[model samples]
Target: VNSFSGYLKLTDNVYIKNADIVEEAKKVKPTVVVNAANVYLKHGGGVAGALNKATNNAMQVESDDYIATNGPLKVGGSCVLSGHNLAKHCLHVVGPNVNKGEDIQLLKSAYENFNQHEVLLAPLLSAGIFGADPIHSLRVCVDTVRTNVYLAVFDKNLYDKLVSSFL
Candidate 1:
């Protein structure tokens, strides 16, 4: 039986898979799990909330503390903190609200920065309310990535499209 729909090998170690991002994050226990967060680091909902739950609320509290001490994460910027469960760290990337200009460049910067970590697990960047098209988001991710990334995609239709194009 297969847990994921399928996967495509990008490099010797990198792969893109059609799977639940949060579930895979728990299973693989990567060095860091990327969280698509707002500037506030609120973990208000979506993948951010899911990952916060998986980490037993540690992420939420840590994120709050981070904001109180430092400041909001600017677009294309990132911050990392201990994961407190499953993953060793939580990598928070602030993607542009695509309503703004520079959508591709900002998203590309986020992807490029996330590649610095080892054994990375990431969901598609800016692919949700941030308003990036799923296909375009994956394209930006695939283009600039340079590490052992396990890309966990959520939607079946989008996954199929990605497979057709990249796999």
Candidate 2:
């Protein structure tokens, strides 16, 4: 497992390991926010197809976790069909499948949410929704969220890539 120590910042965003999510949540003075969704991997996929499998797994797991933590009434499975969720005023979108159309929709939804003063906090992989490279996942998330802050948890590799790419 990877360990994080000391303070690291990419632009204005700071990452802390072994940090308390609830405490961090308090420090964040966002009017509206999106939490990171969990991911569940599909069975029978090796590393060669790991990315795709991982993406599906991440989205499934994260979505479930999101529902559990935020309360079932907050999110809907159908809402997530296109890898997107509109819950408690925030819009959560999963990563793009082989098709880029879904990704475009996610971006558009994010923009719409932002315009309404709502924030979008999606996983780089939608918690493994797309099973694509974490970097690619993050790129999509960043593009969509725009001015909104992204709350990413887990997936250290993707976290590192995001830091390296933008910082």
Candidate 3:
């Protein structure tokens, strides 16, 4: 699936594959999942919608209630919510609304900040709705994740690019 993906072996135990995020999640059976949350989450598109449906949209209210009780989500930081539809643990982060390659430390902290699980599943965080290039986003995860990391990719081209980047 990759030269770039394979390259991860030289750095960390990061693995990337092409599959439906939900299907991959079920297969990997990780203890924790890095959830890219926008609000109790956004109901329209991206990982938020998929995870929301998987958890039966329960995450929608869980996050909304946080906003209601707490305060607005801080950009460049992360939060944790239930991966009710999938993993037993979930790290909810609001991707930084900056361009690709910018504020990577934020991404670094987002992944590093969470210590709930040693093995986890994550997406090409901040690359979808938050608009960072997959390559740059992937770099952030590889740099921060110390344990096992499994990544899901829907696009074969992106998957291929990921593999090649490492070579």
Candidate 4:
């Protein structure tokens, strides 16, 4: 995702320009596709719902004590690992409802403590349920990752339509 390291040589460079993220992601075969979720980790919504089911009914924190104190769910607050993913692992974040600053920074926090080399699949948050423009949401996704990002295709056709021209 940077100047091809002097050590890094060429092979397929399609992803650099953005391939069908899903197709490329399968090959990237990342460790985790981080999902933007709320405190409850919704059971049947957009990305949250799919991720929930795919990861075995839903992602449950090992313990709820962290969230049980009735603290305000701060925008950049830390997150709990959802569960094992069929394809790989998943990270969680709660956004859109949070202010833009809080949302993107919160997204950034999702990557905290993880290896930079780890490929993170970030969401184009707020494009749907949250009602932000896809372009803006994509920008946040790219900015928030602070590293290589992932393929989150909610409205796959819509994603292709919107994301293809940029790369």
Candidate 5:
């Protein structure tokens, strides 16, 4: 069974681990579950897809209603909604597309703009389809987060890369 493999203590409160994001959300029951969302706040694929599935697509309906009312979120912007089965609320943060003009500031903004919560469960923003290096994304999360942070890595290689950064 896949489980948390390695760990790094970023601070007294912040840490990183290779764990199942959904399972961790259920166990930790954090104040907010962060999603690596698109500009439209659509939970179609990647981290968003998994969370949407876990919540039985209720997240998507909320996302659609959110965007229809507030318009599409720009890169680096974030918004919160009902968490469904995950947490008290779900925070949707749009990461920068490195292939486009978006860069580190926007990536950092994703975390910077997040509403404060006691515990935040987050993914490696922009490290996947958005194309930012995992090191860059992880460093930003480590440096910028104000709350207790749980950075969950779902892929083995991504987990090793993040774990190796401190080595």
Candidate 6:
């Protein structure tokens, strides 16, 4: 997975397989490989429910020796926010509310931290929480981070268009 901004770049020959990219990397010669993806508010569980379902299906191909959820489900008011583990070593970098520049700086710090140790993965829409539109979110994220990052975008056509022209 890559950051929304084109700052961090992973040039290694990555073999995306099954639902667990990390596991695949481990089998491919026993080395540390980063597993990252674009996850929205509920992680990728909100909109990319299909991707999570696909990952679950792919996991069926392998054994059921998977790790159960470890952290407590975050509860806001009366609602329970769950899912989002698809991004291994999940980082909740966003602030409690929007309109604060903290979001970008937090993301940059997370990316920098990951770069210093392991590979990182993040979603394109996450930079602006889920409230802000996609275009603005992508722009903010890309502009804030200085390191080379990768953005795992769901819409290929839109991504291509964004690449061709600034939003």
Number of the predicted model whose lDDT against the real structure is largest: 5
Candidate 1 Cα misplacement greater than 4 A, ranges: 1-6, 11-14, 99-102
**For model 6, what is the alpha-carbon lDDT of residue 71?**
28
Q: TM-scores across all candidates?
A: 0.87, 0.40, 0.80, 0.60, 0.88, 0.39
- Candidate 5 residues 1-167, lDDT tens each? 12223557777656788887887887767778899898988777888898999998999999899888999998888888888888888888889978776866888888786537767788888877778888888778777877777788888787887777753
lDDT of each residue in 7-39, candidate 4, tens digit only: 111122112233332333345445665555665
Worst 10-residue lDDT window, candidate 2: 74-83
Instruction: Give the range where candidate 4 is weakest over 10 consecutive residues by summed lDDT.
Output: 5-14
**Tens digit of lDDT per residue, candidate 3, span 1-167?**
32123223425577777766776666555667777765335545787788777777787778788678877765556666666757776777766646534565576666665445666677777777777777887877777777777777777888888878853
Off by over 4 Å in 3: 1-10, 99-105, 114-116
Off by over 4 Å in 4: 1-29, 58-66, 69-72, 76-78, 98-117, 164-167
Model 2, span 1-167: residue lDDT tens: 11223435332332323233223323443233343221232222222123223344554465466566655421111123222222223234223343333443343333333334333333333334434455544454455444544444445665555677752
Q: Candidate 5 — worst ten consecutive residues by lDDT sum? A: 1-10
Better of 4 and 5 by TM-score: 5
Clashes of each: 0, 13, 5, 1, 0, 11
> Best by TM-score, which number?
5
